[PDB]
Symmetry: C2
Subunit: 158 residues, 2 copies
């Protein structure tokens, strides 16, 4: 009786923070979905500090604390995912955390750019993947937060 009970935690990585509402609508949808499953969202803007290094360190700690990262790798300011999100996925990979990714655009990079090179003759990756291959670890690239979360529930039981 009354053993410690772990509450599952997911780090919510993605450029929704740059939305005019600072991610509110995105984070609210995440909160409502996770609440049903007794899963804690670890959100980048939670208890926000004022200094860049403090913000960064708190986010890195969230990744250390999490059971998984669900990362929004949707196009940000062009065809490439957000670099902040990419940094967070790298952190998670190094820490051997479950990393689940999604995007609004699942086309191959070469389909997105329409060629094997960009407008400046720089090479576009040709590995049949939607984004930089460093961001792919073998887990299916999902179509939405919701489909990534379903994988989490099926693969990280309470």
């Amino acid at each position: 009786h009354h053993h410690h009970h772990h509450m599952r935690k997911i780090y919510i990585a993605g450029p929704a923070v740059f939305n005019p509402d600072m991610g509110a609508s995105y984070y609210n949808k995440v909160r409502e979905l996770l609440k049903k499953e007794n899963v804690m969202p670890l959100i980048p803007t939670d208890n926000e500090a004022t200094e860049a290094l403090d913000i960064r360190q708190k986010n890195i700690q969230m990744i250390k604390d999490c059971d998984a990262v669900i990362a929004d790798l949707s196009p940000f300011r062009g065809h490439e995912p957000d670099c902040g999100t990419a940094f967070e996925v790298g952190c998670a990979a190094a820490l051997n955390k479950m990393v689940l990714t999604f995007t609004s655009d699942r086309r191959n990079m070469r389909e997105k750019y329409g060629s094997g090179v960009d407008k400046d003759n720089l090479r576009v990756e040709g590995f049949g993947l939607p984004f930089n291959l460093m961001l792919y670890d073998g887990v299916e690239v999902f179509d939405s937060f919701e489909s990534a979360f379903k994988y989490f529930l099926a693969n990280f039981p309470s």
Copy 2:
């Protein structure tokens, strides 16, 4: 006599790999500079595999093996650094490796975009930094590979 001697190693992160020459000119300059100091460059395209996951794993291992990362965070396909490079910086951070960064453009993000929002009304960070704050750890942002390498030599002795 004849104790093991560690050879210093630096992971060479950056989007030079997407150059028409696959980074040859960049990597050659790096090789020549490091050779003088008996430092090994760990280069992303070295002994390259054919499968995405193998390429990724070999690169992650280079980061595990390195004493530092020197990362090229120059604008890539716009004002944002390369996401592959950003993933590698996150990996290094999580592994407590020395991370040294440089860029060809040291202006604040808000100077680069010319406003507190981008063309789509998405927020541009206002922390007086040249790129996403996740990529800044308190070490000076350098102007070139060479100036970052000088910091390495001064701060990671043989």
